[PDB]
């Protein structure tokens, strides 16, 4: 989690309420006696609307982007329209506490200290209904059928569109816990209802619930947040708070909750109420904590008059080991996805997952107060039944988390610490400058290897069972995204200049450099293959050859067999590597065994035939046999068998074989030249007489006329 | 997207029909009569011609199938609702209901069939479950209803007033906002709906957020809107009293049935509002539409007749190498599923593609024209689906024409040429031309300012041969450019608007199928005094065509349900088939039944691939059958062609003439065949030659069985060994005896180990390499499997010296097993490395001990300076630890 | 599996040959097939030319030859006339039938088509 302050601007009075234009273009405040209209993109104040005569307490758009109401302490409500002109007005007997718009029917509901009034757009008068006590909150249901009124008595009256009190929810404590904020869960099918949108005249005044799955979040002044169903039954227990809440809201799809108030800060919560983190730290009470209608942006208005516009950023927390990929879903769950069978598995942690480390039959999840260690037990390659192995209960501070069979590794500054699964600390390594990267490179269960890179530029290998770091390299610039070849014979480094340097780990010599790399992955199955993404383009290298770059959205997480695995916005994706390009690159260099190794990863049959024929012309009969077998051409297989047995019996001329291959493909001319060069014009004559090309046989009548 | 009337069913006694409902899952057609008549029918001509006359006096107005649970429901003008179930192959009334107030205006089942809403004229609404009143029967208000429809999730339930207002409801009598009608703005008089259809996505959506719901009014204007829209595809029709609306089964075509003032019409539209044609039904007046389950046939009620129209949709298919590519949408995933069904190996390759504007094929390649999140993509793919090259272009790839070494993607106002191959890889020369640019012989590179000028004569179709590029425009004008370097050579200005274009191999003539399906021929080079001329071969209902890759004169076409083949404007006998020409080559036509495949897209049978032989090949084969080889050979020599020569040679080989076969191989210039026949003649036994020839044609199992039956396990083994069937070699070696079976079985086991290891399938190759005796590869399998215990066992099982032990010790050093590496090196007799690894792995005790044993004594300085460096780092404790490990206890 | 089973007299020899490999091997001579006159190794019995199994000389085990053909008068098994004659100098019985066989009983056969007839067509 991380929130960046896009813009902050201070008014001259407490910010009472805020409202967003549904398009998100502009927002509206309620500061003192005027309505400030701000541009969401920048924060430049457009217009102070000057309709009311006293303090403005509330404001709300109509979910249609055509009108918005505002009630004030002057005991009046003014309905403005877009383009910011006041077109309608009416009055109450008291200061208007809050006003809201029906999400579907645009039926305005404005409450006050004594009564609440409903007004349809086509209605010619305001229907006033008396209330038990002072109302402070309005919350229309998503379908627009019910209205929840939170009151100063610690009571919520849920009423229909007419005003009849359908149900009454009594928060414990009565007047001990005034109800200061409420909000319906906005996650329903009706959320998409209005996503396809396209002289002040005073108005007179005229004085089942069981099968529905609706959640009302309630922010009391007994310092608790409750969640109530439409039937009055509560959902779960309360969430004890140490501050008076003043604003409870939701994101666009109702996945997270925003809570502010007596604490001079704003907090993000799960939809269940588990605290996730801090959005902003303010200097006064946050009186409103709304969020942008369709983005991660949030806007916070406090009593000091400050308005702050944060952009919430969620960090990708994930691990990958070969064919398994665990990531953080919904900020509290861990999803382990198989990269072959695509059988996802969800693990509920009920707490903010901080770090994830995955390994063969091991899954470490660093919860804010503990680390959960999960294991696989069935001996199946596709087993996906993770059970809890251990719970290391300790408030951990670590830069990186890694997990090995029977061990856990914590990276913290220059300290690389090795703990058991029961929390016991076994070993500790002190590093040179600062650990930037760490990765398990396999090994025996309790004796595994670790590949460490430092901001010093130095790259080390640390074995869990011994207390000494083996120096692999001392680079020039810092290290990032280390990876090691499948055979542990080659290393690949990214060094803060996007320059992928590949080193021969045993001779300390580098092999090549590439100028744009943000992520590197060696093929776990083909040693020569390399992948690296940087600058929005994929790259696939075969040995020391040119690249075959694509466009890409995201960064490379893995490269297994013939599939790249890239992450784009918490979404994994598989790119199918074109094996034919490295195959033909190896072929042009007359490297047939390596071309076959690349082809075995999967190509078409035309490519297989092309490799077979190029091997034949190149006189590599083993690779030619294998490729032809994968095409199953008995003609060419029997030709190669005949050539092999002729070679076995003693024939050791490498031009007769090429002449035969050319004659057998159908050249009939280069084959004749090869036949003559190898000292056999008789074979060329036989070829031309068999083909009945007698005009060419005259050329190869070299012997003369001895019959 | 073509359409033609195909059948007719005259209802007896000339009663008027007021409703046709084609059951989608089962091919049942329910027809409502004007005098109490109600009939259930089924095709394949009728199979289940039924007269469900139980009840239903007066007239019959509404008819709805329940799909799941297969329950028909029918209503009178007297309000008698009857629900019918299929019992004992006949339809019997199951439920009967009668509300005695008004007439049922409409009925509709839920998206899952568990709930039904019926709307009356007096405003009463009755909603029932499959058995009884589910929730409510509401009396509503002073309104007259005409329609009813559920949503995808069955939550909203939108009605239609008699005065022309659609009201959105709650799944109860709770009135939500009235719908905002955007299609009618300038209308003035009274408006009635007459047609509402919501495509409950059940075969996927053509676009991830395509318009689904569709409303039309009797005046003629329609809006295709998603949920409750405010801006939405608007359409204007000349349909006076539009009679009906029907979505396709995939929701990709909308059929609007009405009649202009002028006469009956069934127009077709795309979900985004693009027009597609007009059917021009005979008779007095239409009454209802109903698509088939597969959307291929549409039944429409005209007077006392049920006219059937056959429909050819726009399938996204292609043929590359031996692979049929075909794309379809599915409910679960929001992107197109494209199957690269390789017919040669009966393999499938499912890809998932987001945009997928088009699929085009040429040679062993396939261009998928797609829309990305450099806004549009052209993915160049292999025949097995692997994307070789995604090329990002900006203009819309509305029309894609793919020649080998060129790809032309044309929008309505420009075309883009990209060379993707060389006659052999990417030599990209990307160019963009506006249609009215008249490019010169050659040239600006990637100048995209030409795609925004706009034109009054848009592009309708494009094609490109190896030499020329033909752009068809909406006025009938075609423009011809030189393809390798685009330059405007000629303009022709044909008669009718072009839909499909094709060029023969000579690029000398062009076959044009217009929008109405009429096929004509243009001769580009035939100069009359003008430049090009027509050819007077107008056909009527053509919907597919293909030239030969070999013969300029040879042509193939599909008209309605028959395939015709033309040799220079001379048609042959038709072939009753419904398929798409995958290939026309070597007197052979390969076609596929996409209509059958796309009904079961998961499992395409090989029975759907049909091969035809044109008159020449069929005649030669039949003459070979009737008279002996000797005379058919003379006939084929009179009319020579390489395909016929190869057929004659293979027939002779089957008969084992070995003389006619050799001559016919000479005719084909087939040296492989000549050599094979010479080798076969050198062989001196029948049933040896028969085995050889049955191996020649690829009947490997037949050849193996033949060799076994003649008591030759040797030659069966040899045949299996020339091929790669090593499992077959193991199976055969299990029985009988051989000259050298231990070596043969070891070779088989090593080869299977290689077979599994080349596919990265260790723990299967490890099973072999052990029954066989392979060491070099077995160590690699253990290493990649990280079975270091196996590596240790292998290293201790090897002899004292070996070429593999040093490699094993290096592997051990890399993984970090000092002890096993030291033992392996000492087995190699390389103590120097055995101590260098102890130093490297910081096992100084072993290093000093081995120095004392093997007399190196150079590690004292190593320890001294290592400890000096450690002390320089203030790690005195580490120095003490090493000095204790190295037994330098004094220090 | 076969380790720790070589005769103690020969373990030294076996380990000596393996430790210093000697790939030096004299090539086996090639002789014609009796059916198609194809040159194949003397000890190879399946001819790659005619795909026919070749009878083996009961004296040497080599495949039979047309120009050195003979048969034991007792067991009617093929044999190489020169090779059988040379081997009979030190053995007084047929190697195959274990019957009393002298050198004089061998008659060189010129027409061996009786023994070269394929069983399928005969
Ligand atoms: Zn032979
Ligand atoms: Zn004998």
Numbering used by the authors:
A (entry chain B): 1 to 198, 219 to 227, 246 to 745
B (entry chain A): 1 to 44, 59 to 276, 283 to 393, 408 to 457, 471 to 490, 492 to 577, 584 to 945
C (entry chain C): 1221 to 1342
What does the paper say about this structure?
Cilium assembly and maintenance require multi-subunit intraflagellar transport (IFT) protein complexes: IFT-A and IFT-B, which form repetitive structures known as the IFT trains. Powered by kinesins and dynein 2, IFT trains shuttle cargos along axonemal microtubules to maintain the steady-state ciliary length. IFT-A is also essential for transporting key membrane or membrane-associated proteins, such as GPCRs, ion channels and lipidated proteins, into cilia. For biochemical and structural characterization, we co-expressed and purified the human IFT-A complex, which contains six polypeptides: IFT144 (WDR19), IFT140, IFT139 (TTC21B/THM1), IFT122, IFT121 (WDR35) and IFT43, with IFT144–IFT140–IFT122 and IFT139–IFT121–IFT43 forming the “core” and “peripheral” subcomplexes, respectively.
Purified IFT-A complex showed biochemical homogeneity on the SDS-PAGE and gel filtration chromatography. Single-particle cryo-EM analysis was performed to obtain a final density map composed of volumes with overall resolutions ranging from 3.0 Å to 3.9 Å. The IFT-A complex has a dimension of ~380 Å × 150 Å × 140 Å and adopts a “lariat” shape. Our cryo-EM maps allow modeling of almost full-length IFT121, IFT122, IFT139 and IFT144. For IFT43, we resolved residues 121–192. IFT139, made of TPR or TPR-like repeats, forms a right-handed superhelix and is distally localized in the IFT-A complex. The IFT-A structure revealed five unexpected zinc-binding sites (ZBSs): two in IFT144, two in IFT122 and one in IFT121, containing strong Zn2+ densities. The ZBDs found at IFT43–IFT121, IFT122–IFT140 and IFT121–IFT144 interfaces could be critical in mediating inter-subunit interactions and thus essential for IFT-A assembly and stability. Interactions between the “core” and “peripheral” subcomplexes are mediated by IFT122–IFT139, IFT121–IFT144 and IFT121–IFT122 interfaces with estimated buried surface areas of 596.4 Å2, 1220.5 Å2 and 3191.6 Å2, respectively. Notably, IFT139 dips its last two helices into the first WD40 domain of IFT122. Part of the IFT121–IFT43 complex inserts into the superhelix groove of IFT139 and uncovers direct interaction between the HA–HB helices of IFT43 and IFT139.
